[PDB]
Automatic annotation (TrEMBL), chain B:
Lineage: Bacteria, Pseudomonadati, Pseudomonadota, Gammaproteobacteria, Pseudomonadales
Keyword field: DNA-binding, Repressor, Transcription, Transcription regulation
Organism per entry: Pseudomonas aeruginosa (strain ATCC 15692 / DSM 22644 / CIP 104116 / JCM 14847 / LMG 12228 / 1C / PRS 101 / PAO1)
Entries under PROSITE patterns matching the protein: HTH_TETR_1, HTH_TETR_2
Official protein name in the record: NalD
BP term (GO), one: negative regulation of transport
Gene (name only): nalD
Top-level division of the source organism's lineage: Bacteria
Limits of the HTH tetR-type domain: 5-65
One Pfam family cited in the UniProt record for this chain: TetR_N
């Protein structure tokens, strides 16, 4: 009953944020566009930052799935995961739309403090997982001399983030389907001995 | 000549501080004028609109095309590495650069009202990418790429890494030290692209 109202609100906000930007989109405007009362929006989402965060959650992998996925070869699972993430830019319109909002249509003022904090936390976690993965004896032994797990996880994440950022800014740059393999290849070849 | 160039700088500094604190959307030209100790007409007079103002601000911090080319023209796969290394390291050594780029990647949303700024931003990136592509495409360099690494992919992989490092660090500066970690963050990309390295 209410879960249908929640989705309606988030879809409306998704469209508005995407067209107008987050700053220039109010909760009143979202309510109106969703065919709903202002009170109902405030009721379900409290404030704009929390709304924005719930929206992002529709598209983020929960911690339990990440861990389970990276637990034979973990260094190949990580590659696979990254490859699929890049490839998802094409195959998942919802993901594409929401991430273009995140990286292109919003500014992290005080009013979005909560959203930034939880965004940082999510990235921090992914980085910590990779760090831990690279830090295992089985994996660490395979890194090149002077590649530490700390640097490896950060180099990798930066690459993924950059690809997302570049492509969403300008989708002519590459094809997420057929170029993803080759865009990621050098990073993994540069980190790992055999590859 | 000079009289007005002083007024221009004052306006840009005011906007830099305001954009950084409030965000670009929530910063008006009226507010900039007031913070700069100047009339609203003078701002409009020097910069026309917010997007153009924002673009002039970024220009203070961008390498012109002629310097890029000159820098990448013995070993030039090395000059490119050096250039990237310095870019990452500049995050610490140049506060003005840091402030303005934090605005670009963190404190502004590319709506219609900033269409002009986005277009010229794209053009600048497009150019850097085209230069790298051309560099990797030279016989001297191309021969050194691994099997199935094309210049097109190489330039885009590299740029994405640089962009990502800037983005990550400016979002969370605890992640790494631009001074002492830059070498090691870039190392694998270059080792992965080039045979000998």
């Amino acid at each position: 009953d209410s879960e249908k109202t929640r989705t309606a609100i988030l879809l409306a906000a998704e469209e508005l944020f995407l067209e107008k930007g987050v700053s220039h989109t109010s909760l009143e405007q979202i309510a109106r566009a969703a065919g709903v009362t202002r009170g109902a929006v405030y009721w379900h989402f409290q404030n704009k930052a929390h709304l924005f965060n719930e929206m992002l959650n529709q598209v983020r992998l929960p911690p339990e799935q990440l861990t389970e996925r990276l637990s034979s070869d973990p260094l190949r699972s990580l590659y696979d995961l990254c490859l699929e993430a890049v490839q998802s830019l094409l195959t998942q319109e919802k993901k594409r739309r929401i991430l273009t909002i995140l990286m292109q249509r919003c500014e992290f003022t005080e009013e979005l403090r909560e959203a930034q904090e939880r965004n940082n936390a999510f990235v921090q976690m992914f980085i910590e997982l990779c760090e831990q993965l690279f830090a295992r004896d089985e994996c660490r032994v395979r890194l090149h001399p002077g590649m530490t797990p700390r640097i490896a996880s950060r180099a990798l994440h930066a690459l993924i983030l950059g690809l997302f950022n570049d492509w969403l800014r300008d989708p002519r740059l590459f094809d997420p389907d057929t170029d993803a393999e080759h865009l990621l290849e050098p990073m993994f070849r540069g980190l790992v001995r055999d590859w």
